[PDB]
Each structure stands twice: as structure tokens, then as C-alpha cells.
Structure 1
Amino acid sequence: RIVNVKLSLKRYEYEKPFHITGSVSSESRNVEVEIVLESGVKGYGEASPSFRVNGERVEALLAIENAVREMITGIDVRNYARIFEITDRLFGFPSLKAAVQFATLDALSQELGTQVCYLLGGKRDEIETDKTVGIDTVENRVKEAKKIFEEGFRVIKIKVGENLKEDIEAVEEIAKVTRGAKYIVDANMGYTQKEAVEFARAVYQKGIDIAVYEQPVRREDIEGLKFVRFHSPFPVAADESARTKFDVMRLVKEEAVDYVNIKLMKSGISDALAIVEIAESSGLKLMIGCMGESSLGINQSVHFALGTGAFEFHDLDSHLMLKEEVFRGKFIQDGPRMRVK
């Protein structure tokens, strides 16, 4: 049984300001969650809130600690589905819902003498993550891409969305100096339907291939996502448009996207498991991403990816661009690779 639930503010500074369409941050403010069982076992999770995507504010998450304690204290973690149903009511605090649910499995796995990934199926022993190139001058972008490549990463994520002409130029220049790497382009809702299509065609015409083209249009523009999917050569993904399992069922029914970028910070463990199943029962493919998690937080996604083995691509690099005193994940980080202990 759970006897205590602790929420605490943890700040992590980025080695350099991270710039994406309509957003710039140089710090990551998360909420660490610790669940304590009567047996003494302690499970840990981390919420990396997003005002832009989930409408959350870190001050608001911290303010509801007492409410969270009242919601699940006294419940046995072996009845984790009950804890999941209850925490699903925190749909307005997605990142916290995610942290609490993972900390629950973390505690439960310890009690069963195993790990979260195995509890989830233990499908894979290793996964590889890409690394992101934020928005900057074409020169700086090429410089960072070149450095990431030298670091061993074979999948480079490129942010775009604020300047179509320069975005195209940037992607073309990056491709030159990183031959052999796969590319994921993320526009974070910055383009109109037509611009998005133009972007993809321009790049395509230069012989460049994009493995995944992330959320090119606004979140409510489901038809726009479909339009881009049906009128451009690269696989299109929903990110901001895919937060819950209901959003995904709708995206599938509408045949709007080739991919859904799952993020525990958007869906929590409960909806993420539903999305995995929905994708495996349809033509949908998945990738897993992150917000601003530290190593403790990314640990949640690593165990989820390793356990379900449901992703074609993994974008779990937020902890790689953060100055963090010490590693706190329950996994092994070896360059672009992440493995089970």
C-alpha cells in the first residue's frame, strides 16, 4: 500500500537555449514524484509540464500535491489499474498523471523483484535515440548537426517551422555533411497546409529523404494533417494533435497520419498503452518523444519503449541537452543507445 506521495520542483539548465517554432527555453522546470509504500519500497517518476502543448504550469502541478495524496494513498500497487483509472482524472495535469503512474509501476516492479520494462513485456533489450538540432542560423544548425553526427547519432531531428525558405536551405545543408543519417523534421505546427507540402516537395526534389515529418500544421487541423499526408512523399506524424487515446482513435478513423509521436507527458502510461494497441491494430506507426525530462524522467520512456518495443523511432534526448549533476535513470546510456541493466 501507498503511504506517501511527494512532489518536488527540480530545475535543469540547458547547455544552450532551445528554440522551436514559437518557443524558446534555456531551463527545464520539472516536478519529481516519489511514491512510498508501506513496505518501504520507493518508486520515482518525473513530470515535465508543457504550457504550450498541455496547457499546464509547474506552479499548478505543485499546488495539487495534497489532492494527489488523497486520491491514491492507501491503495495497493498490485491493483495498479485502480490507480490508473483514478489518475486518469488528472487529464488537466497530464505530465503529473504520467509521473504518478510510472512511479507506481516503478514501485510495483521493485516489489515483484523485476523492472518496469519486463512488466510491460520486455520486448527489446536496446533502443537508439536521435538527437535534436534546434532552430538557429543555417550555419549554426549545420555546425550542430555535424557535431551530433560525429557523436555517433544516425538519426538527426531537425526543427523548422518559422522560415520555409531558410528551413529548406537548412535541411539541405545538413544532409550534405551527415551522409548516412536518417532525418526527422519537426515543424511544431508552424506551417500552413500548402507550405508544409511545399517544404516536403522541395526537400524531396533534392534527393533528400525524411523518415518522419512531425506535426506540420496546427493541432486542431486534423484535415490539414491528412492533406499533407496525401499530398507529400514523407510519412507525416501527429504530435500536438495526438494527446489522448481518443485523439488517436479519431486520427486513425480519419486516416490523417502515418505516425503518432507518443509522449508519456501528453498521455500518461494508461493512454500510451491504449495508443500502442491501437497502432498495432491499424496501419498506424509510432515513435516516442519527450518534453524537457531529466534523466530520471527519460527513464520512464526508456522502460516503456524497451518493454513494448512498439516504436520505429525514439526521440528521447531532452536529458542529453541538459546540464545534470549526475545520471539518475534506471537504464544504461551508451552514446545514441540505451539499454536495460
Structure 2
Amino acid sequence: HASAIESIETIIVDLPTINQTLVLIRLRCADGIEGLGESTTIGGLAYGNESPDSIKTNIDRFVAPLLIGQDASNINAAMLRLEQSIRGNTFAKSGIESALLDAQGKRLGLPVSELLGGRVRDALPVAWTLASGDTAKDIAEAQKMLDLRRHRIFKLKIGAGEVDRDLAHVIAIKKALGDSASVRVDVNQAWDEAVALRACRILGGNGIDLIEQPISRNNRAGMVRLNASSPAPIMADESIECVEDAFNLAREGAASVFALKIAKNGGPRATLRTAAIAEAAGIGLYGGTMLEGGIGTLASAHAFLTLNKLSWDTELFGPLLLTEDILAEPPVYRDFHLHVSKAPGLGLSLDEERLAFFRRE
């Protein structure tokens, strides 16, 4: 009549942006406590093998049956029970663990960061992706975010256009901002090593601070070679699809910085194991996102608050892209940071009206 998991509801929500689809998880226990989680991805199946649609399918058909009736207060046991019968599906697992953590936090009256060991900071620096595709527009937007003291670290997505044009674009943005901001790029696996070996040298010699996943996660030997030739640090993102990938990447020397995404590792706890491996290997950390709304963003944040050091900051700006979220109170952003409260669990509540209005069904 207390901690037993009573029900797990998965809801697909479509929210307008400045459309983003989220998968909300509502986990309820026998004692009335409800935990909220979020499994969100980008562009259907273009950025991962799990879509919001298949996440709901697999949670409803396989995850729920395994957890209904289980003690929600033993999260390690619940997640291992899942790992025993379910391969992959890390996005789904991440949402489920987030919900369990939120519920256990409420149950003990402690924020998730404390359940995870204890925070060493209350705020996290938040970078911003400039996505207009227009050099002039990006520079203006960056200067705007700087003036409003919202962001001072900017990320540029490149790789889709002609290499020299992408490079000129990013370099022109850094040149305009100078030392007033940190400029990084994400190539999303777009380049072949033949192109990256030259492009990384150019970006590194022109003020770009970090080069995220320049080539395919499949060119394992190539990522190692690029770490040696690139004068700028390389960060692994897509190369990490589970905690074990983190170890293998560190063993091989495939990247000097690891992006930490709860969706890719299977939840905050799994993400902290990936962080532990990176730290033990002397690899830098970055708080990554799959553009989650407030729930997923805070689930990530609470884990990041416990890290000794986050040398490369975070990109937890997902909520800032939504013209409307399903939360009664959005996360707090001020002076270049995301400020995380000490409220129990994830410290957020659902706005039932907006949920009913935006839920696909």
C-alpha cells in the first residue's frame, strides 16, 4: 500500500517551437506519489533508432509489464530488472528512471541531485545553438544573448553544406564575437575523415574551442587519428550509445571530451557511470541534451549538479525552444546559467490543462 508501482502512462505531446515532440512518463505508486519522466528525441528517426512513437510502443508493451507491481523505492533493482529483459531502448529507460527518481525524491523529500549523492553547485552554465544558417543573423542573435546575459557559449551545427562555406561561416562568427564568447561546432558525424583532418586544423587555428563528433561513430580508428592531428579538442556524442561505449572510446583515445546525455546512456544514473569512466580516464565532461523539455532537462541537470567538474559546460537549453511547455513553472535561466532548486524530486509540476491541450492523444 506504499511504494509498489501501480501504473505507468506514456503520453506523446507535440509542442510548438520558436514543432517538438516529447514523450511524457507518468509513474504512479500505491502511496499516491507520482513521478514524472521524459523520453524525447529529435526528428523522428533521423537522430536515433527510437522515435517518440516506438518509445511509447515499447514502454507500454514491454517496460510497463515488467515494472507494475515492483517496489518503486528500489531504483537500482527496477532498472536492472529492465536491463535483464530489454536490449537498447535507452531513451525509454531514461524517461522511466527519471520518473522513478522524481517519485523517490518526493517520497523522501529530497531533490534528485541529493538522491544521486549531493550537489556541489546550484547552477549550470548553458550554451546556445545558433541555427539561423545565416552568418549575419547568428552574429546578431549571439550579441543579443550576450547583452541579455543569457548565453556566452555558442554552438554551430555544420557539415551539411560545402566544407569551406561552413568553415567560413563559423570562423566569421567567432571573429565578430572575439573573446566575448566561446564558439564550438557540432558536425553530427557529417564529415569523412579525409575532410575532417583538414577542417579541424582550420577551425582550431581560428578560435573554435571544441569540435563535436566530426566524423561517423563507425570510423573508430579515424576518431583516434583525428585526436592527434586536431589542434582543437574533439568531443564524442553519437559515438556514445551506452556506458560501455564510453569505456571503449576512452580505451582507444577517440575523444578528449565526452557529451553526457541521459537519453543515450539510459537515465541519470547510467550517465553518471559514463561520467565516472570519463573522469577516471582524464576526459572532460559536457552536459548534453536531445532538446528535452523541462522534465528531461531537469533530470539531466540534477545529475550534472553532482559532478566534481564540467569543464565544457552544458547545452541544457531545450526548454528555451518551446513557445509553451506542459509544466506549470518552467526551469529558471538567468545570468548565463540554469538555476536548479532544492525542491523534492525534479521540483516541477504538470500543468494539466496544457497537457490535455497538447497531448497527441
Q: Establish whether TM, by shorter chain, passes 0.5.
A: yes
3-state SS of paired residue (1:308): coil
Q: How does 1:270-281 map to 2 (within 5 A)?
A: 270-281=269-280
1:2 aligns with 2:1: no
Structure 1 match to 2:77: 82
Shift of the alpha carbon at 1:309?
Answer: 4.6
CA RMSD of aligned residues (A): 1.9
Shift of the alpha carbon at 1:110?
Answer: 0.9
1:12 aligns with 2:10: no
Shift of the alpha carbon at 1:335?
Answer: 4.7
1:36 aligns with 2:35: no
Change (3 A) 1:35 1:335: farther
1:8/1:62 contact within 8 Å kept? yes
Structure 1 match to 2:46: 52
Q: Distance in 1 between matches of 2:157 and 2:233?
A: 16
Structure 2 match to 1:137: 134
Give the structure with the larger strand fraction.
Answer: 1
Change (3 A) 1:194 1:182: same
Q: How many equivalent residue pairs?
A: 328
Shift of the alpha carbon at 1:135?
Answer: 5.9
3-state SS of paired residue (1:77): coil
Structure 2 match to 1:158: 156
3-state SS of paired residue (1:75): coil
Q: Distance in 2 between matches of 1:189 and 1:296?
A: 28
2:12/2:53 contact within 8 Å kept? no
Change (3 A) 1:328 1:45: farther
2:203/2:232 contact within 8 Å kept? no
Q: How does 1:174-253 map to 2 (within 5 A)?
A: 174-179=173-178, 180-206=180-206, 208-210=207-209, 212-253=210-251
Q: Distance in 1 between matches of 2:215 and 2:109?
A: 45
TM-score after normalising by structure 1? 0.90
Q: Distance in 2 between matches of 1:10 and 1:213?
A: 33
3-state SS of paired residue (1:281): helix
3-state SS of paired residue (2:306): helix
Structure 2 match to 1:20: none
Q: Distance in 2 between matches of 1:94 and 1:318?
A: 19
**Could you list the per-position Cα deviations for residues 89-131 of structure 1 after superposition, in whole angstroms to 9, with x for gaps in the alignment?**
5443221110100110110011111010111122221111101
Q: Distance in 1 between matches of 2:86 and 2:319?
A: 25
3-state SS of paired residue (2:36): strand
**Unpaired segments ≥5 residues, structure 1:** 16-26
Q: Distance in 2 between matches of 1:9 and 1:243?
A: 23
Structure 1 match to 2:256: 258
Shift of the alpha carbon at 1:32?
Answer: 0.1
Q: How does 1:96-107 map to 2 (within 5 A)?
A: 96-107=92-103
1:56/1:92 contact within 8 Å kept? no
Structure 1 match to 2:333: 333
Provide the identity percentage: 24
Q: Distance in 2 between matches of 1:166 and 1:191?
A: 14
Shift of the alpha carbon at 1:293?
Answer: 1.0
2:272/2:303 contact within 8 Å kept? no
Q: Distance in 1 between matches of 2:300 and 2:315?
A: 10
Shift of the alpha carbon at 1:137?
Answer: 2.9
Structure 2 match to 1:268: 266
1:215/1:237 contact within 8 Å kept? yes
Q: How does 1:281-292 map to 2 (within 5 A)?
A: 281-292=280-291
Q: Distance in 2 between matches of 1:329 and 1:263?
A: 23
Shift of the alpha carbon at 1:226?
Answer: 1.3
